Design a protein around this ligand. Structure first.
Ligand SMILES: *[C@@H]1O[C@H](CO)[C@@H](O[C@@H]2O[C@H](CO)[C@@H](O[C@@H]3O[C@H](CO)[C@@H](O)[C@H](O)[C@@H]3O)[C@H](O)[C@H]2NC(C)=O)[C@H](O)[C@H]1NC(C)=O
Ligand SMILES: CC(=O)N[C@@H]1[C@@H](O)[C@H](O)[C@@H](CO)O[C@H]1O
Ligand SMILES: *[C@@H]1O[C@H](CO)[C@@H](O)[C@H](O)[C@H]1NC(C)=O
Ligand SMILES: *[C@@H]1O[C@H](CO)[C@@H](O)[C@H](O)[C@H]1NC(C)=O
Ligand SMILES: *[C@@H]1O[C@H](CO)[C@@H](O)[C@H](O)[C@H]1NC(C)=O
Ligand SMILES: *[C@@H]1O[C@H](CO)[C@@H](O)[C@H](O)[C@H]1NC(C)=O
Lengths: 341, 146, 49, 107, 48, 77, 49, 40, 40
């Protein structure tokens, strides 16, 4: 076992005798005094403290849940010519319900990791929504160029966010063709990221401008997808809800969920109250908190009491009992019996 | 080394043997093509982890050896152990698993030598403060030195 | 507080007073002979004389 | 998930009056709501679709208006043979939720 | 008064940052990597 | 003693303001205050540490009653 | 090893690069693997990924 | 017009319960007996 | 069967010489007076 010994070497250069530091308080006194012979009196060997038996985690109750049901569970997803941007803020956003369900297959969250998402505190979430073709999964990515990247909707080069999208064939495919979903082939400008071109101007290619009519080398850019259920998986409807993130501009107001833990009283616990951590014994108090105050401090900046979240109780933080370990001994001539203070 | 091929479970329900619904294979491939850029290219890493003296010293360098001198103040190099002192004969009978003897507070007391296995003692060279007995510059400039 | 303990004194406050009452009774009863050897009593006008 | 409510529950009406029944949504269904009518022992039928427009082939004694979370129709000329339980139906989010009902009664 | 004021100063110097980002050790471990949290702890150790 | 009500994480820069029959407009400065807390937790009295040297003695000694004597409270430069 | 110019990332913490032959090491752990191109920073004490 | 501000304008600085203690804090405060400007 | 270990299990820590010095080290030692398992 990983113990600590006290070896006595000799004039030969060999070990003669030893004690174990964790066997009894007599040999603990021999360890902390570094001799086999203790004298008669009191000696402080080590420090005793009560360990935290179990931990409790506490955080304010989630009554403001973010509108992820308004951006995932919707009948009419708007198309990519009129892609709908909603600002998700002043609530608690749950990405665990997103990650733990697998209606999608193509997470690919650039920037932040897909696993550690509910712990980081973002400030501003831009929830975009558009429907594109089934084979355009590679185009919604940082760095990749093409029709959907350049002339439809561009993701930035330093894009931090998840590219959440499911390939639905039941909802957005009509037998004969859903001609409501629309995209652009011809456009005379590569689009900068987070830009929305809803204008319906006539594209001129070859020589002579048409300017209001359609004909030779004058193509209307607004063209239909025409989704059919007999198509392959590259031509199926592909419902995209991309989530843009912070970009260091705001204070934090949208955060991940925090699982609360039921509290136990009159025991040494390792608590967490609203970001304030510590170890102590929680008990009831008769100190009248004013209703805006969350934690109370004593003389010289030590947290004496904290106001309990989710029930508005006032709990007194008592530190766990500690003290030095004193060993009463008569000396190694007299006896090996000890008393522990 | 994590050589095991157990599939990773992410979302809810453990598949336990079938790659599929919330069940991704952990071992995904590089797939190197020479048309890739330098940030996508292979990189043959050969890392040389040392420890600095968990053991007796075995991996030395190509520096040439030097003949030994007795009872003089020298700057020795005993398999990477650099120190100063005189090298005298010792009567400390070591057991044959020791390579060096160690004094109080991380100072080396006795070292057995390479290529000979003859035991040596390290005593530090003679030091001490200097002191001046003077009667004062007003009386005389004659100086006793202690 | 954290890391701070106050050790109690070996002589308590009711029992330092027993030493002071013993010194007062010895002084008033015997002059200074209890500080030298055995306590030899004396009347207190003779002591103050 | 839309808690779809309507007030009042049971209101009476007389011959040829102007009645107004409202129906409220918890979340924004801003321009997608449908109005139905259901006699006892009879399947319903559309009255007002998308909260403004009307179907061809209905008697136009009524019209519908409203946006946001406040929706209504006004029957400008009531007749005693209706006496039916009126239903709202939004069209914004899954699952699709009806209302409890405003049953009209004659005095 | 001198003993209680020396103890009150001894408790009150736990709130000093000593040039670090925060004075709470669990707070500067909870959002930082180990080998910069090492030099963030070590300033508090030498100051206290 | 004025209790807080709200805390809004807006994060927008504010420089000038305008109000929608008589009112007082005061300005705040970064000065140190000594706050006396009651047993219920409310503020009973307060001392501005930059008003006069008697209040400098009060903020130096951290008490509202100073005894008779001389106190070195600040440094003239 | 030092005079070979085929490498570009010698990059040695712990013992300094220029004085390396003079110490006598005890155990040398010559590990070897092949990685993705921009993962040079993650083989370093502290940088994680 | 101008008015002396007397002793008004003191708020709770840190939302911490404190009892029977003299606390010194350094935030933005209205100074005592300063000129507060009166409008109509 | 089980036997008391008494005061056995003591070895040299780190292959290093030390003489007439009370030395404290923390290695994987056999604890004193523990139970060892006896097979016959
Ligand atoms: C968007 O819609 C989906 C589908 O409705 C929501 O996912 C969850 O789906 C399951 C089954 O499809 C449902 O869970 C239900 O939970 C109750 C209470 O535990 C149980 O009694 C039922 O038998 C059923 O299992 C439910 O539709 C839903 N779960 C919830 C809402 O807790 C999804 O949550 C919706 N929102 C988002 C942001 O994706
Ligand atoms: C035309 C246009 O995009 N206007 C604004 C843009 O300037 C602003 O940066 C963004 C977020 O504040 O909201 C939108
Ligand atoms: C070896 O051990 C014996 C036994 O106590 C001791 O007397 C002697 O001094 C040691 N040294 C030598 C060199 O024999
Ligand atoms: C016990 O006492 C004797 C003298 O009374 C002394 O010589 C001896 O060293 C003591 N034993 C110890 C300290 O182990
Ligand atoms: C030097 O010593 C003499 C006699 O000891 C004395 O008279 C003289 O004043 C001394 N010089 C000085 C500078 O004190
Ligand atoms: C504290 O509050 C209680 C109840 O509000 C009151 O009775 C008591 O007088 C207060 N103490 C003061 C103001 O010192």
């Amino acid at each position: 076992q990983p113990r600590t010994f006290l070896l006595k070497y000799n004039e030969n250069g060999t070990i003669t005798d030893a004690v174990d530091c964790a066997l009894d308080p007599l040999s603990e006194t021999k360890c902390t005094l570094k001799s086999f012979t203790v004298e008669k009196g009191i000696y402080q060997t080590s420090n005793f403290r009560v360990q935290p038996t179990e931990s409790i985690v506490r955080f304010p109750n989630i009554t403001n849940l973010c509108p992820f049901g308004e951006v995932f569970n919707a009948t009419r997803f708007a198309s990519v010519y009129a892609w709908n941007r909603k600002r998700i803020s002043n609530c608690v956003a749950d990405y665990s319900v997103l990650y733990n369900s697998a209606s999608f297959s193509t997470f690919k969250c650039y920037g932040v990791s897909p696993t550690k998402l509910n712990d980081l505190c973002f400030t501003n979430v831009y929830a975009d929504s558009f429907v594109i073709r089934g084979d355009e999964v590679r185009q919604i990515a940082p760095g990749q160029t093409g029709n959907i990247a350049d002339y439809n909707y561009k993701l930035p080069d330093d894009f931090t966010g998840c590219v959440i999208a499911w390939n639905s064939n039941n909802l957005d495919s009509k037998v004969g063709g859903n001609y409501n979903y629309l995209y652009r082939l011809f456009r005379k400008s590569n689009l900068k990221p987070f830009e929305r071109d809803i204008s319906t101007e006539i594209y001129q290619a070859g020589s002579t401008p048409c300017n209001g009519v359609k004909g030779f080398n004058c193509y209307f850019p607004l063209q239909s997808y025409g989704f059919q259920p007999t198509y392959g998986v590259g031509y199926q409807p592909y419902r995209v809800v991309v989530l843009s993130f912070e970009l260091l501009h705001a204070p934090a107001t949208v955060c991940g969920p925090k699982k609360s833990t039921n509290l136990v009283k009159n025991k040494c616990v390792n608590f967490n109250f609203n970001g304030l951590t510590g170890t102590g014994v929680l008990t009831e108090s008769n100190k009248k908190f004013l209703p805006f105050q969350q934690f109370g401090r004593d003389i010289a900046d030590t947290t004496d009491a904290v106001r309990d979240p989710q029930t508005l109780e006032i709990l007194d933080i008592t530190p766990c009992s500690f003290g030095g370990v004193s060993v009463i001994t008569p000396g190694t001539n007299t006896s090996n019996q000890v008393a522990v203070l | 080394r994590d050589i095991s091929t157990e599939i990773y479970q992410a979302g809810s329900t453990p598949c336990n043997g079938v790659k599929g619904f919330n069940c991704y294979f952990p071992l995904q491939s590089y797939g190197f093509q020479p048309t890739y850029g330098v940030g996508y290219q292979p990189y043959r890493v050969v890392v040389l982890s040392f420890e600095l003296l968990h053991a007796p010293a075995t991996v030395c360098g190509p520096k040439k050896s030097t003949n030994l001198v007795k009872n003089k103040c020298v700057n020795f190099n005993f398999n990477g152990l650099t120190g100063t002192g005189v090298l005298t004969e010792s009567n400390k009978k070591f057991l044959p698993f020791q390579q060096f003897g160690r004094d109080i507070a991380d100072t080396t007391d006795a070292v057995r030598d390479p290529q000979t296995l003859e035991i040596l003692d390290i005593t530090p060279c003679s030091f001490g403060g200097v002191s001046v007995i003077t009667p004062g510059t007003n009386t005389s400039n004659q100086v006793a030195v202690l | 507080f954290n890391g701070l303990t106050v050790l109690p004194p070996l002589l308590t406050d009711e029992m330092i007073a027993q030493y002071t009452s013993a010194l007062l009774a010895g002084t008033i009863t015997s002059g200074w002979t209890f500080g030298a050897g055995p306590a030899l009593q004396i009347p207190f006008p003779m002591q103050m004389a | 998930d839309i808690q779809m409510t309507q007030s009042p529950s049971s209101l009476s009406a007389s011959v040829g009056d102007r009645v107004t029944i409202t129906c409220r949504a918890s979340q924004s269904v801003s321009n997608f709501l449908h109005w139905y009518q259901q006699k006892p022992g009879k399947a319903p039928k559309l009255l007002i679709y998308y909260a403004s427009q009307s179907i061809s082939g209905v008697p136009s004694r009524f019209s519908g208006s409203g946006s946001g979370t406040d929706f209504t129709l006004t029957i400008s000329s009531l007749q005693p043979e209706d006496f039916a339980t009126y239903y709202c139906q939004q069209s914004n989010t899954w699952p699709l939720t009806f209302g409890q009902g405003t049953k009209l009664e004659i005095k | 008064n001198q003993n209680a004021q020396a103890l009150n100063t001894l408790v009150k110097q736990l709130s000093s940052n000593f040039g670090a980002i925060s004075s709470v050790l669990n707070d500067i471990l909870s959002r930082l990597d180990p080998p910069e949290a090492e030099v963030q702890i070590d300033r508090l150790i030498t100051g206290r | 003693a004025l209790e807080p009500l709200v805390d809004l994480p807006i994060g927008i820069n504010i420089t000038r303001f305008q109000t929608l029959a008589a009112y007082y407009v005061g300005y705040l400065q970064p000065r140190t205050f000594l706050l006396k807390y009651n047993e219920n937790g409310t503020i009973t009295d307060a001392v501005d540490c930059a008003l006069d040297p008697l209040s400098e003695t009060k903020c130096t000694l951290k008490s509202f009653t100073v005894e008779k004597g001389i106190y070195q409270t600040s440094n003239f430069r | 090893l030092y005079n070979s110019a085929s490498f570009s990332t010698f990059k040695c913490y712990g013992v300094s690069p220029t004085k390396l032959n003079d110490l006598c090491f005890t155990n040398v752990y010559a590990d070897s693997f092949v990685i993705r191109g921009d993962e040079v920073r993650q083989i370093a004490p502290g940088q994680t990924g | 017009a101008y008015t002396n501000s007397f002793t008004r304008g003191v708020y709770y600085p840190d939302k911490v319960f404190r009892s029977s203690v003299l606390h010194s804090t350094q935030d933005l405060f209205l100074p005592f007996f300063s000129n507060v400007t009166w409008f109509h």
